[model samples]
Structures are given as C-alpha cells and as structure tokens.
Target chain A: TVKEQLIEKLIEDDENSQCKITIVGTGAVGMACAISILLKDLADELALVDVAEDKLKGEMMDLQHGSLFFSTSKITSGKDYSVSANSRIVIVTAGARQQEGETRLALVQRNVAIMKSIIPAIVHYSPDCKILVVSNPVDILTYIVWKISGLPVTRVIGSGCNLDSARFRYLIGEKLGVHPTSCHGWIIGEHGDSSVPLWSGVNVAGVALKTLDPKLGTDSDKEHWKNIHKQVIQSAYEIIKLKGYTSWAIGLSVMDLVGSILKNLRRVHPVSTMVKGLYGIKEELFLSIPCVLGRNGVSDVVKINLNSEEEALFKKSAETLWNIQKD
Target chain B: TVKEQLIEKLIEDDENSQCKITIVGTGAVGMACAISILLKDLADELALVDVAEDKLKGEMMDLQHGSLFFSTSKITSGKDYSVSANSRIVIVTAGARQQEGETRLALVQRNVAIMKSIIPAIVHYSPDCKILVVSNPVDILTYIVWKISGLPVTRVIGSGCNLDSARFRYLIGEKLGVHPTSCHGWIIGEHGDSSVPLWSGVNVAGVALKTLDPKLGTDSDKEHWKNIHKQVIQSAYEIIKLKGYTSWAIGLSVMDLVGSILKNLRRVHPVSTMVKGLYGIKEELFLSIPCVLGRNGVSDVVKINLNSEEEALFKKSAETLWNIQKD
Candidate 1:
C-alpha cells in the first residue's frame, strides 16, 4: 500500500531530475570539487572512486554525514568502476605526487601512467560522459584522455588557465580597488608559466585599461601591469608553500566549468580543448582557449583578435605544452 | 590618481555591501559552517578564531587558498579576538570533546566553561553582533549565553530543533516519495529526544496526510509515522556511529539560520529561543519554537495551535531541559 502511494506521487517530481557526476579521485582537490558541487546543488547523485579504501570511506562518510544539507539524493564511493556507471560527467583528479627534486617530465610520466589506468575504466562505465581532467599538466592529460577514450574533443576538457585567468582578474581588480567580477580578461594557452595574459582584452565595466590609463603598457605602468600576471603565475607555488597544497580555488574553478556544462549555461570560459587550427597553432594539442560550454559540452571555441606580443606568448605556451606531451 | 579614481567609483558599489560573519572555532563543524557560509555568499568578510594556533593557521590557510572562489573579500583567522571586530554575526561552535563514557552533565559543564570564555571575547569584539550557538545542549547554552553576554534573547539563538525538523521533514517526504520542501511540518520543543513532532500539521502539497491515507495515525500507520520521528532523534547517533561525527547537515543548518539573519529573509524556522511566555510554558528557558528569523534576529515567536498530545510532549521536553539546567 505504501509502495503504491509512493509510485503515484513520484511522477510529478521526476520531470526534471538532475544528472549524476563521478569524481575519479578523493584527494584534497577531488574532495574540494565534491564539496563545491554539493554546495552549489549541481548534481543529483555523486559517485567517488579512489584506491585508498580507508581514506575514501572516511571522505565519503564525512560527506554522507551532511546528506540532509545537500540536494544530491545519493553520495556513493568505491574502488570499483561500477559505482560510477551512467555518469553524465566524470572528473579525473587522480595522479601521482611529484617527489622533491623530481624532473617535471618524470612527474608527467608517472601521472600519465595513472591516467592511462583510469580513463578506460571510466569510458567503459559511462561512454557518453564528458571527461573533465583536473590533474597536473591538465592540457597534456586532457589531450591524452581524448586520444585514449575515443571521445570527441568537445567532450574531453581540462580545467586549464581558467583559474589563472580568475587570479588575473582578481589581481587587476585588487590593484584598481574594483570588484573582481567587474573585470574581464583571459589567460589563454598553457595553465603554467607559459600562460599568456591577453592584456589587450583586459577591461573593467566595458572600459579598456589602456583607455582609462594612457600610461598603461608604456614605460610608466608596464611593470605594474606585468606584476599582476607574475603574481598569477606565482599563486600556486605561494599557496602551496603556505598551505602545502591548493584546493579551494581550483575546486571552485572546476565547479564553474562543471556548472556551465551541467546547467547548459552556454557561458564562455578559457578551458583546455583542441587548439590545432586556431590562432595559427599548427600542432594538434589541447590549450586554454575561450570556449562556450553547455550541456552538450564545448559547443564553440570563441575567436578573439590578439596583438602581436600576445600571439607570440600564446604560441610559446603551445610549444612548451607540445614538448611536454612529445614524450 | 588610481586611488582617486577608485574612491569616485566606490560609492556605487557600497550601496548594499554584505556583512561580516565570524565563525569561532576551526574544528570540523566550524570549518563546515565556514564553507557553507562562504558557498552561500552570506558574508562579505569571514573571520575565524581558536586557541589551537597551529591547527587554526592550517585551517585558515586551507580556506584562504579558495578565497578567489568566494564572494567574501577577506578570510582572516588569529589566536586573538581582535580580528573578529565589527562582525555582524559571531557563531560560537567551540566545545570540548566528550570523553568515552562521560556523563552528559559532565560534557555539558565542560562545554559551558568553553562557552563562558568564548562569549565574553566575542561580545568584547562585536558588541552589537548576533551570537549563534551551535554547541551541544544548544538550548541550554543559548540561555546561558543570553544570561552571561547581556544580549537580548533574540540575539542569542541556538541551532536547535531546526536541523531536527529538517530531518523530520526529509524522512516524511522520503516515506511518501515527495520533495521535502513541499512537505510542511514542525518538530518543536527540545532538540534532543523529547522533541515534539506536530503530526496534526503534517501536510503534503496542501493535502494533509490524514486525507491521503484515512488509516494514518491509527493502528495501521501510527508506527510508520512514529518511526520517522524516531529516526530524527536517532540521526545524530547513527551518523556519529558511521562517521566519527556529524558536520555537513548541521553546517548547512547553521548556514540557513545565518542566511535568514544576514539577508533579512524573515523566514520562519524552528530555532531555539526564549519560549517561556508561549504555549503554556511557565519556566524561564529557551526551547525550539517556530520563530521569524531576520536581520535583527528572532523578531517574533509564531504561535501554532498544538494538539493535546503534542502539548504534553512539549511540556515534558521543557521540564527535562529545565531539570538539566537546574544543576
């Protein structure tokens, strides 16, 4: 009788059900992403996978404890891939940590091995799911995932220079004493040191920085403007030095990317996708370029004019990423 | 010149700036509360304070790393109370952990001592701020805080049966397979075992459960309805048994209470406040009753007619709380 009553009442509420999301790792970044997603009410169900059974259980239980606080009806975790079945999005945050004095290439190789093991299992479970790569050297890993999984370039994205761009905007806003959201800018290409800041595109409230300050990009304020990008580049090392790891900002950044896809926002974001034909980039590689994201994944890669200096920097970033991926 | 320009543009943005919320503790519950508050964008600035300097710094840095993701401009923490100055709301979540096999009275006394030290420091910093107590025996501690801080009863509130009521509503909705938000009911009186569930008020989509099922609350379905309340009362213990402690739901619960205050939502919530003059309550004590929560804190105690059975249970809960406070 109770089952019959419940069945009758369920139809009205099931019209617009949310999607399932799977996080491939339960590390600090993964957990942060999970919390951000839950807090934003992005997913109807969240599944987590980690090799560390005890720690995964602990993390899952901690999230489960606040089940009533989240709109997500279910939070499940396991070492097995079966738990992540039917996911609309599978976010990979699993990787090997770099040892002290280790070469970047060695670190990349180790993480690549881990990703190689992770991607196929995810593809097997949710072949149609969009894979969001958040592990280090994200552009390379995203490309590797796309190559390995047989998924379209649109469905395999990386949280690339989005956070760097956010930092760029925040720093500019801070320098000008304005709200960060009011400032618009981009950090395209790589997500690391080679990342390029499109200073020509920087504006506040639709007013270009150059227009507001005539001395901008000239000898008078060149260093001042450049210092903002330096800080953006140094943000990760600085935070990692102080706190041992960066989580919250990247977590929020991933949430923003996931939100765009999940909610079909169709908002433009600078995330890693194929950049072979865009901006004179010849080599096939993933780079941070402005892309419109929605429920169907990256719908479009936005084209913006770049000054000579900006174009040179972006090409350099692409070369650096290609060199890393060559191995 | 930049400073002059910033000052000119500042007025337009400062018209309705958000308020500061200080979370007093850096433990799991406190961190969860902080994250929830930040995620909800309830505060313009967030301050944290704790006696454990190392752990506090670690916790603060973790939160600070994600600062760019939050709308709150500043996230500061320190051993001293000075950082919490000019706060709009000070949430006290500091407490001593109960020893194994410790009596409830002993645990309460230890927490009371912790609260005594915390309230004065908070009051010293933010004299006009609202104090929200989330410590265990919250109703008693809320009353104690009101007595000790010399703040109005409205300003010194507790996260009491609010969470309990959420759990109650969630269980009822789950049983009937409906959205919890669409279900209207209340779990009033003490936040603990003696909490009173107003079965008479339980309705789904404006349809009373009695009407949905004529056998409801009779022998056939009485146990089913009663089981939901039992689950609500046992929720904490069950969660604590599963996880080491409960944080997420309570974190969310506090966020909801704090949001109503900062945004002046003026929404009704069953929060613990002075209930002496209402519902035939004769003792001078705080209990969970449906109250209007807004910028100035509890503005009005809502009066809803209670059935004779519910009234008796509520009175019994008040008596139980009074007996504990007597010592």
Candidate 2:
C-alpha cells in the first residue's frame, strides 16, 4: 500500500514549480523521461497523462515501483490536458512507428491524423507550449503540425536525427572494432532517406576519418560513407527483427530532449524544425538539422549545405509531403 | 574537453569486458547517456569515438569535469577500432542533426548503412556481444542487425516504446494534477503508430479514469484518450520545433535501458523485438511490445491477450512490416 500512497503523493505534490517540463505521458518513455527529469531536476512537477482511468491509477501506483532505485521526482497520471498549462515543452509520440521492417515515413497518414487532432487541442490548452513530436514520419509530421497549428515552425518540432546521430557514433565505434558511442559521424537533411552524413566533421583525436581509415582517406570512402548512412537508417528495422520495437533507445531520446528543454540549456541537436532559406532549399517542411533549444523554444536553426544529391533528395522529400498536404 | 573524456572512458574502456555502451557520437543525447551509464556503473572505462575526434575528446574531457556530479568514470578518445573487444551495446547516433524538423525514425536508411560496416566488425570482434539500437527507426535496425549477424533475437533490441510508456504514466499524473511518475500505462506494438495502448489495467489512487473525468466516463472517454495519446506522440516534435533535437529525454531513456540491462531487471516494455506468434503476426520485425530486458539482453517477450481492436491493429501493423528489409 505504500506504493499506493506514494502514487497519491505524486498526484498531488507540486513543489516542482521550478521545472519547465511536466512529462505528460508516463508510459515507458514517460516514466524514463520523468526519472531523467528528476535525476537532473529538469522540472519541478512531472505531470502524467493517460485515459485508461483505472489503469492510470494502477500505473501511478506501479511507476512508484522505481522510486527507490533511481532519481527522485513525483509521478502521477490523469486525463486532463489543462494540467500541462505550464509545460514549456510537450513531447508528443501518441502515434506512429518504423520498428524493424517498417519505415518511419510509412506511418505518415495515421500519425498525421493523430497530430492534427492533438495539436489544435494542445495549442488551445497550453497556448505557450512548445511541441516536441516523437512520432513516426517525424519530418513530415513536424512540417504538417507547423502548417496546421499556425505556430512558428520553431515552436513545433520533432525528435529528428538526435537518435540517428547517436547511432552514427555507436556504429562508428563498432566499425573500428571500437565502442559504438566512441565514434561519431552524422547525416543531415530529412531524418529519413534524404539525410546526408557530415563526413567533413568525422574525426578522432582531431584526426579526420580519412586518417582513421584508409578507405575513408580516399574517394573510395564513398562506399564506407554510404554504408554507414544506410546502417543508421536501418538500425530500427534491425532491432525489430530481433525484438518487437524500440523502447529503451527511444525512451532515452525522449528523456534527453525533455531534460534539455527544462534546463533551458541552448544545446544543439538534429531535430525537425523549419529552415528559412538554408540548405539550398526553402524550409517548407521540417527536417533533421542542427539547431539550438532554450526557454523561448528554438533559439536558432543551424544550416549545413546538402551535397547535390542530398539537396535534391531533401527538396524532393519536403515537396512530397507538401504535395500530400494539398491532396 | 572534459565532456569528450566522459564518452571515451565510459564507452571505450568498458569494451573489452562489457564495454557496456560505446558512444561513437558526442552531443546532447550522447552526453546524458554516457553520464547516465557512468552513474549506474553499467560501464566504467568509456572510450569516446566521433567523426569530430577533437570534439569527442573535448566532450569526454568535459564529462570528467563533473567528477562530483554523480559518479566518476574514466574517459578517452581515439581513432582505432582495435580498442574494441568486449563491446556489448554500441549506442550509435553518429550521423547528423541538432534540430527539431525531423524524427528519430526518419534517419533509418542512412543509419542502417552505418550499421552495415560496423556490425560485421563488431561481431568479428565481440562475437557474443548484444546490440541495443538507440538510433531512430530503432526497430528497423534491431531486426537488421539480427538478420545481418544471425544473432539470437534476444541479443538484439531497439529502444522504443519504453519512453512513450513512461510518458503515458507522466500524462496520467498530469491529469490527476499530481506527480508525473504516479500515472502508469503500458504501450505495445509498433514503436510508432502501430503501438497499442494496453489500457486494460490502468489505475491511479485506487481509482479509474472514469472517476477522474466525470464528464467522460469509461465508454465516452474516447476523446480524452485521443487527446492524451496524440499529445504523447507529438511531444518530440513540439520540443524539436522549439529547441531542435532533444537530448535529455532520450539520454534518460538510454540510461534507464542500460540500468535495466546491467541490473538484469526484467522490466516489461514496448521495445522493438522479433515476434513469434504473440499477436499472430510472425516474422522478425521490431515494434513496441511488452519485453523483459536484462544482463543477457532481451530476456523474454510477454504475450498478453489483446482486446479485439488492439489485436487487429497489431496484426495490421505487423503485416505492414512483414516484408520490410534493409537495403
């Protein structure tokens, strides 16, 4: 019953006023997100949300399950969106997927449908809320939400290449027979197929990838470059073939994102946000690119040039979604 | 820098024995992830890797700057994969992005390519190592790695629905106007849209959602559910729009996953995995579902009866990815 009481306290306690985030959903990502928030004190009160009434009650009780093992933060759940009033940023992942054999872009329609419904309401309830989408077809949906919500494109975003960028590091580590997180490389553009790796930035101890790998030193590194990019993109499907879905990896991504938002640290990442006149393409749709996040939402968007192919692909990808919207 | 050293020691040093997770990338998610792992002692000697080797070193060194924050972990950086030996999980995110215009899933194909060059080498070095895909479209990569290496499904996984499930509980708490961790909900199925919310057993303060919102009792709570789910899914986008790619949320998710794995805790979640008749759709494809991850990797996949709709959606989602394979 102590778990039950803990749950109750979590539901009512509100000293977390200093925190800017209120992890609205407390499922796996939510719990992990809340825990991370607490561990980092990213927010004061982490507001939980769900509609399985009784189940929500039980979950509140259960989430207390981890209180002893890790960070401290109050976790509670309910069905009201109003509680999210003070939430500076809300991470939305209510629908969409690309586990294993699937593609994130594949879930476009359903996820978009879900976003359309949620955005209007969330905007109404939390007029100042900054939206962080964690759903599939992330780039597409991010653009859609910006268009649909009439909010600054910077106010509406997605968990773009952050995870992918991390994967880049992980895979590079593995490639040199090194640790995955030890090596780093990343792709920019659409978080999807159009993404381009910033090979210009790859290095180790200030040594470029060219020096690290002979293949990389030559134009033949092109193959290695292509392979790495493909690998990052296919990582989701790889896990699904062995597991059913991506939980922990994504859960961590969400936790990290929320932590940054609440802390108001102007950190950079590859999220889905609008580009004004950068990357050689008009930023009609949101895509994975570097930028800064802070208390006011997107503090700035960083642009990296897309090679001819990446530029073409990036433009084509954004236009594809634009065309779909008109339909 | 101190930060890069953090990645180096936590990711590289641990490779020979259990290189718990090698961070090949250094950024928001990577930083939190390395720190989280070090705090849990899941890894100690982390070797940092990155295309930006200098930055990676700087980041690792910077991480050491916080020797007093939580726990102390060794950090280093280099260009040699030869340093890799007992690597376990490579938390890859090498490619690009620091914005909110894209989703993790969107970086699938390119990231998948990264895995191709890395995985074979990883297996060549650590034949028994387990893979934890944290990159976008984690499910896709989870399965891809499984098929590529022919590793047991349990040895490969994608970090997917755990964060969302945690968020679900957080949202529930928000509704109850309480702590975010108090509310609980289990999300399963595709890490994205196909994910099914197992609302069959949610409870908060010994009460159900019906009582929380008298206006929308049990059956009439459809809108409430939609609102919560939509918001949860879209959270990532919202944050990205404001701050680009989020780091704290996912960082925590990865940290939690590592903790669960290192501690050998059999926590259930909607992580990407290979299914064998749980939802009737058979094939190796990752999606969010109930799974137990522990020291040996994914320990087991829980099979619970799904409501008709849940079952149907799961089946549909699974079928959608049955033929999905990485290039």
Candidate 3:
C-alpha cells in the first residue's frame, strides 16, 4: 500500500514532460554544453556518460554540487549507456583530439574509431534520440556517424560551420560597430578552411554588408572583407594555439544547435546534414548549409541566392568535403 | 562633423541601456557567473575586472569567441576598474582562496584587505553600483564591505547561505524524489557551519516536509532529517575536498541573485544583509535571512514566523555571525 501510494503521488506530481539530453564526454566542450543546458533550464533531465571514471565522477560531483543554483534538472552520470535511455538528444563529444601539427585525415581516422565504440551504444540506449556530432573534422565524422548508427540522417547533425558563421558575423559586427546578433550571414560547406562565406547573403539589419558603412564600400573594402573572412577561417586555429584547444565558442555554438532542436524553434543554423544535390554539387556528403533546425533536426534546408563567385566556391568546398569523405 | 555624426550614431544605437554587470575576478566562480549571464542573455554588456592580466585576457577571449552563439552582449575585460564604469551591478568575486588546513579567519582577513583595496575603485568608477560580495567567510566580509564602502545596507549583499539553502532544498528534494526547485525552504544566518535551516519553513508543493511522507513524520524521522541537514552543511566542504574548491553552485547562486536584481523579479533569497532586532537578535550584522531582491537590491527583508526551537537556533546563528563581525 505504501508503494502504491508513493506511485500515485509520483504520478500526481509529474508535470515536466519535456526533453532529456544525454551528453557523452565531460571534456571542456561537453561540460560547457552541460552548463548551458543547466543555465537555460532547457532539459528536465540530463545524463552524462564518459569513459574517464575519475574525471566523470569529478564533473558529476561538480555539477551536482550546484543543483540549488539553477533550474531543476534530474542529473546523473555513469559509464553505462543504459543511463541514457529515452534521451531526446544524445550529444557525442567523445572523440580524439586534433593534436598540433596533425593532419585533418589523421584526426578523422582517430575519431572514427571512437565513433565505432560509442555510436552503437547511443543508438541502443536512445533509439529515438537525435544525435549531434561535435568532434573535429565534423563533416567527415558526421557522415561516418550516420552510416554507423544507422539512424535516419535527419536525426544526425554536425555542429559544422555554425561556429564559423558566428565568427564571421562577429567580425563583421565589429567592423560595423553593431552587435553580432544584428549581423545576418553564414559560412557554409566545410567547417574548416574550405568553408564558403555567403557574401551575397551578408547583411547588417536590412543593409547589405558591403554598404553597411559608406566607408566600407570601396575597392579597399573588398580587401577588408577578404581579410575578415580569412580571420573567421583562422579563428579556430588561433584559439587552439592560445588555449591549446577551441571549446568555449564551439561549446556555445552546439548548445545553440541543441536549443533550436529542443525548443523546436525552427531557427536557422548552418549545421551539417547529408547533401545529395544542392548548389550543383554532385557527390553526397555531410556539409554545413543553411537549414531550418527544429525537434526534427534538419526541418528544411533553405535555398539562398549566392553570387557567381560564391557559388563556385561553395561547390569547391563541397567537393573538398566529398574527397575527404571518399578517402 | 565626423565626431558629431559618430556621436549621433552612438546615441541612436544605445537601446540596451538596461542590464550591464561588471564582475571583479575571472576565477572559476566569476567566469561561471559570466557564462550563466551569457547563456541566459541576462545582460547586454558584461565587463570583467581582474588583476590577473593573462588570465583575464584568456577568459575574455573565450567568452567573446562565442558572441554569435548567444544573444548580443558586448563583453570586455581588463585590469583597470575604469573599464567597469557605468555598470549596473558590480559583483566582487576577487578575494583570497582558502587553502587546505587554513583557518577561516585568516582567509577572511586576507579577503577583507582585498575588499578594502577594490570596493573603493568599484565605487569610484561606478558611483551608482549595487555590490554583491562572493568571497569566503561571506558574512564577515559582507559586514566589512558595508562598513568600509559606506554604501546603503541594501546596496551591499553577501552571497551567504543562499547557496546553503539551495543545498538544503536539493537534499530534501532528493529525499522526496522531486525537483529541488519544487521544494521550498530557507538556510539562514551564516554561509558556513553555523547556518540555520528553517525546518519549520520547509515544504513541498504546499505539503509540510514532515508530511511529505508518513515515514518522514516520526521520532526517528527527526534523526533522518538531522542527517539530511548535516549532509547539506557538509556539501561545500566535501566538494572542496574532492575538487580543491567549490565554484559551480556558488557561481549559480549569485547569478540567481543577479537575475533577481536585473529583472527586478523581487524574488526571495536567503542572502546576507545587515540585520537588526530580528528573532530577538539585537546586533547589527550581515546574515542570511530571506529578503526580497530587485533592481534596488534587498527591497525588504521578509519576516517569517519561526517556532521556538528554530527561533533560538536562528538567534544563535545570527550571534555567531555577529561575533565574527565584532572581531
């Protein structure tokens, strides 16, 4: 009778029936993502899974120690996949690091091995979960994850050029002396150096980027824009050189993806999903493109107008990713 | 003419003149608070002031790198207090760290000295700032700051048992198998060992703590409740021993206070402020008692009836803090 009464009370008290996310890996990025989730009160429950038992325990205790400070979420952690059951989102940040002087292919090869070990466990435990990839060479790893996990490609996403695009916006915002959020632009295709900035789509509020300031509308302005674009591409490398790794920005970037998914905000993020044929690209690859993100992952890919030069670069970027995927 | 035009543009763009917080110290707790602010988009501008130039630059870059991932917030940092001018709230997390085997009084003395150095610079730059103190031995330091800064008592607060009360509610929520936010309680007096848990004020969804379950309402149940209280009191120390310092929850607790202040939510938190003649305690001391927080800071201290035993314990807790203040 006591058990039955307790069950009845629990049933009566149950109200929060929203998303639950399981984040695997408690590294800098994973912890930052978890912190964002807690601060925003996005999920009702969160489970963190990591192979580093000691590190996991420390992070678990560190987070649990602050339960009183933020919105309530039932948080648990362990090495077991079952701890992640019925999760709405499974974020995989458990991958190999891209050590300095290492080639991208080498990093991809190492993380592919990690994916082989963790993706199936995620699929087994959270069969219906949407997976977001956050490892290096994210485009290649995303495609590999989709193939390995056998989840619908719609449910698998790579936090691809989202951070790159954000970097681009911020650089432009800095020049225009406006808030970065007021700048509308995106970096598409590969998440790396080959990524394409949509010059035609760049705008500050309603003003085109090139015309946002009259001082920036000359031939020298074109050079300035190219310099800014180069800075966006190099930000990750520069940050890595400084901090030994780039996590904080990417951490915030992926949480933005998670937020769009959990809240079903249908926000636009240049996340990587399988692209068969877009912008005259022939080969299928997971690449960053403007897509409407929601609970359904890539709700719809938005087709945007790119100038001739930008279109050619976008195709080249896609081909670059295809070669990497093929290898 | 160019300068006048630029000034006009600046004035036209000044819409987010609402929430701007200057956090002094980019240590673990301060950075966590900054992250919370960014994630919640709580403030439009966050200025970090710390003496550690290299560390401050690194943290500033880490956060600025994520500018596009969250709402628009102009984040800047430096060693000079002038960078924090016109801040709405000045949160001081800059103080001495308590090392293992160190006496709390010794740590308090160092922090008091630090506060004497920094609080004046804070007020010198931002004359209209409401200050929140988050150093160790918070009650004593809060009193010291209030006395030294000569700010109105309401404008200066100690992040005292606010975290302790949260731990109390969380532990109780664990016992009841519910979300900690759903359980209401208060931890008063000191932020340390002498803190008082208002057992009489504990409740879960309008159900008294004792009646949350029949098993929780017996003579031996008193023993169980006491154990929970002991666990709450030991949480910070256990966490410190495990990780070398406690930051996550206090980072969160102060943000909760910050949120209340910025949003003018007028929410109740067990924050330490100058107390006089409450629960038959006649000494003026900064101790944790439930107070209404808003844009004006500690709008009013809420007076809740305490049973005889709880009242005696409350007086004792206040006196313990007073002794520290007097010393």
Candidate 4:
C-alpha cells in the first residue's frame, strides 16, 4: 500500500511542492534537530507535533520569528497529526524517560502506549512516510512500532547506537588530536547500556586507532584506549549529570540520520531495524547494525568483519534487548 | 602586512588541514551560530573564545561530547586568545547589548571599548583571518573594527541588513506559499530601524513579488507589503519581547554568511563593509549593500538598479548611520 501510494505521489509531483519533514515532539531533542534541519536547509516545511500544546506553540513561534535567518521551511505547530500529512519523514521523539530505576515492563508498556497513539496517527496521515524512532530503548520500541504501524520493516528505524559510535570516534579523535571525521568505527547492538564498541574496527584516516600516530602506536596508548571506551559509554550519563539531560549530541546524531535518508546520501550508520538473520542470529528482533540508509530507509546492512570478541559482545547486546522484549 | 601574511599562509598549506573557524563569544548568539556550523559540516576545526570561562567550558564539553553525531570538527574552547591562532575566520559576537533605551553614545563607546579589547587579540594570532562582526549597531561597529584593527576593509564584515533581507524574502515567500530561497530581495543600509528595502528589486524567481501570483498581484497585496516591511523591522523586538532575547535566526543568518566566504560559494549578501563611494552617497563609512563574499571576503558589490524612490530612501538610511557616527 505504501509503495502504491508513493507511486501515486510521484504522479502528483507536477505541483512541485517542497519536501516536508515532521518532527513529533517539542522538547530539547526535537527542537535541536529542527534547528539543525533549518540550518542545513534540509526541508521546505517543518511541522512539529506535541502534547505540550503551549510549549509547541511557543517553540514554533520562536522558530517562525527567526525563519528568515535560516531556510525557507514553513514551520507549523499543533497537537493534531493532520499537519504531518504527505511528509517525507516523521521523526518520533514522543516517549517516556529512561531513568536508572525505571522498570523494563513499565518502560515497554509506556512506549507501547506511546507507539499506539502516535504511530497510527502518523501513518494515517502520511502512509508513505518513513518513521525514525528517537526515544530510548529504541531497538525494542522500533520493533514494536513496525509491527503496530504495519509499515514494512525497512520504513521503520531507530536512532540506535550510531550516536555511541559517533561518541567512540569523537573521543578517539580528541585523544589523538585528529578530527573525529578522520576516525572511523561503529557502536552496535542496543542503544542503551548493552551497546558494544567495535574495538577492532577503530581507525583514524585508514590507520588503526592505536597505531595511527607515534604517540598513539605506543603500548601505553593501548592502555589509554580502554579509558576512552569507558568514557564513551558514560558520556550520556556524564552529560545528563552536568546539564541535567542529554540532547545536543543526540540531536546532531538524528540530524545525520535524517540527512542520509532525505538526501539519499546512502551513508552507513548504526540504526535499529528488524534483524531476521544476521551474524548467525535467528529470530525476528531489533538491534543496532551498520546499515546504508536512503529514501527507501534501510537499504541494506553493511556486513563488516568483526573480531570474535566484538561479535560475542554484539550477541550479548542483542540478547539483552530480546530478553527485555520477551518479558 | 596583513595582505602579505595572508599570502604567506596560502603557501603554508602543505598539511591541507581542514579549515578552522573561531567564534569570539559564548553567548546565546554564539552558541546558536556554532550549532548551525556543526550541523552544516562547514569547517574541520571550531575554536571558541569567551570571557565567560565556566559557561564556555560547559558549552565546549557539550559540543565535544556530541561531536560524533555531526561533523568531525575538532571543537576547542578557552578564555585565552591563543586558541584562535590561524583560524580561517574569526566571528566577533562579544559586545554590550543594545537595549530599548540604550543611548547611542554609550552604546558605541562601550562597543568601541569591546572591539579594542577583542579585535587586536584576534588579529594578533590569526593575522590573515576575515573578521565578521555580529554585534548590535553592527554597521557602525564594523567600520570601527576596520579602522581600529587596520585589516583591509574587505576582510572586516558586519552581519548587517542581510538578516533583514532574509526576513523580507521569508515573509514574502510565506505569503506566496513558496520556498524563501526562491524569493530574492535586498535590505540595505543599517541593520536597525533605518534599513531600506529595495521594493523595486523584490522578486519570486524571475517574476516581481507584487506580480508573482495572480492573487498577490492585486492592489490589496501592494497595501499588505507595507505591513510586511513593518513586521520585518519589528521582528527583533517582537522576538526579544517574547523570549527575553533573539538568537536562532541571526545565528542562522551569520552561518549563511560564513558558509559563503569559507566555502567560496561567492553568494551575494547584504554585509556591512566600508563604503567609500557606493551609490550616490559621498560618505566614507560602512553600510549594508549586496556584496559578493568569497575567500577574500567582499569580492565585489552587486550593482543592482534601484528606482529613484529606492535611491532616495537608501541615501536617507545612509545618513541615519552617518549621523550616529558623527554623534
């Protein structure tokens, strides 16, 4: 049905209307992503949805007043889903917080309720729209959304461990005094605590991270690598501790995901999607893996060789999400 | 000396290191500008300088922690000016606020003091850097910075009427139900109340704005244009009144200017630079006019044909800024 509708929309292209993007939530994450989108001149229309009616209105008005400074995206705000109609992508950030003591059952059930209320509303208005989940426990929630929304699995994505991977490269880059873009790696599996770093894959400008420079190639540098990985894992918590919540980095992370899909850049990123059979794993589940994203959403997963240790950690991370989902 | 130094840096390009942009403030405007820069992946290294050491450190850490999500730009922050050494562009956003009743004498005197302290510091390290001023009373301050720093006029720019022109295009685009980038216009002279709109030059694509749409070409639309101009002039006041102060839009506008120069996009914008003999005005000072900006900054001013009425208004606007300077 979505494929058919997309074909129909192709015929409707004679109107030559601008591409529209819908962001569901007006909180820090949502607003930051919107700002990034505006800055990049990514979309022609940016529609914001939130239950915080006053906040949504306030944020939308603020963006609108400053609209002249950025792209020509017409920013509209509402509590209604109607504004999201015909959108190319709908980024869902409306969900509960994942605090330290929050029970798995409570988080799942709460997100389930969130998915039910928002997903159908989004699909009802924009059936052909790709959905990007940015809420916490994103792997499981992305799985639940695809099943509930009845969209093809490729059209559903979770803002998974990509941010973690970005954190990995960024920290490594910092220690090496190299640009983070020069460093390459991935953080795979659950977006949460069980996320695994692909240690063997770490490289700076085609050189292995540990051997990239004279100072880094040293054995002492290998000892420092462990500390950097730990810092990447603790980054979100440390940021939340400092600023009371993590938003900007994740906001930037999602912006990258949005850019890949919208522009059909087809860049590889670690996002959670349905994992049927990968890395010798069986059973329908969701976990973060390096995948190429485009207008078709998850086009294909990049199958990179992972050392035995990294693979074992990946399996354990996937099992953590599967166990939680089964419960 | 500065010109020769710039040529020398050109020869010192063996490493082909990524471009580094320095922002000389950590306030709302500065941070917003930085976020936009990060989102666009405009530069490889972003060095920040601010007197607000604690706030600057917090912001820098926050950006560094999230650097994985966007571009790999190496972000560094400090109160020291040394961190800004050899930056491609130095954006000066540090200055006293121009409040509702701030006297012109005090405003200019305070900013003059601010410029004396910051400009030399920026030039001392990054002698070849192009300085972009985004402070209040920017047109006058831009002129002051050029005179004080003694960098050639082309290398000193003010985030001038370009934001106002952007506002004009955005507002016109909204009314026409089209993308703002498709709309073209210019707002010249001071960034403040005396800014002049080139009514004769406004267009949506190749068609003049007043004649672009059938409904819009009507006489009633002409009457509505006056109100839109008023809205553009009052945009900052309305935003500041609502949210205490405005930043995002101006931040985005400055980013566009930065994008033009650093990327050598050579796009036309209304940045304030010393105008020795542009138009019919005889004054030798800075005023906003459509200037082509590139690596050298202010490559040339686009000499657009303005109606006699528009020319009169431009002269009047020029006089307004000149009077302020004399006072």
Grade the docking of candidate 3: incorrect
For residues A1-327, could you state the per-residue lDDT of candidate 3 as single tens digits? 889767655345674436889998889889988988788778888889999999998998898899998774688899998889889999888888777798867887887788998899899978888999987778888998998999887899999988888888777767654445435677888777778777655654223444334334234564665566788767678887788557778778877888888877666788898888776777778888877777877877766666676788878877677766776
Query: Tens digit of lDDT per residue, candidate 1, span B68-160?
Result: 898988888998999899899999888778889998788878877887787888899899999999987788888888888988888999999
Summarize candidate 4's per-residue lDDT along A81-175 as a digit string, tens digits.
99898989999888877667978888898888888888998999998999999877788889888888899988999999878887887777666
Write the number of the candidate with greater TM-score, choosing between 2 and 4.
Answer: 4
User: Mind giving the per-residue lDDT tens digits that candidate 2 earns over B177-285?
Assistant: 4434223356777775556765543444222343245433134675665566567778876886787655777778887787777666655556788876566866657
Better of 1 and 4 by TM-score: 1
Worst 10 residues of 2 chain B by lDDT: B203-212
Candidate order, lDDT descending = 1, 4, 3, 2
Model 1 scores a TM of: 0.50
Global lDDT of each model? 0.82, 0.64, 0.78, 0.79
Give the Cα error of residue B324 in candidate 2, in Å: 67
Give one digit per residue, the lDDT tens place, for model 1 in A73-96.
889999999999989999999877
Interface RMSD of each: 19.5, 19.1, 19.8, 18.4
Predicted complexes: DockQ each? 0.01, 0.01, 0.01, 0.01
For the second chain, the TM-scores of the candidates in order are 0.91, 0.81, 0.89, 0.88
Give the Cα-based TM-score of candidate 2 against the true structure: 0.46
Pairs of residues clashing in candidate 4: none
TM-score for all predictions? 0.50, 0.46, 0.49, 0.49
Q: How many backbone clashes does every candidate have?
A: 1, 321, 0, 0
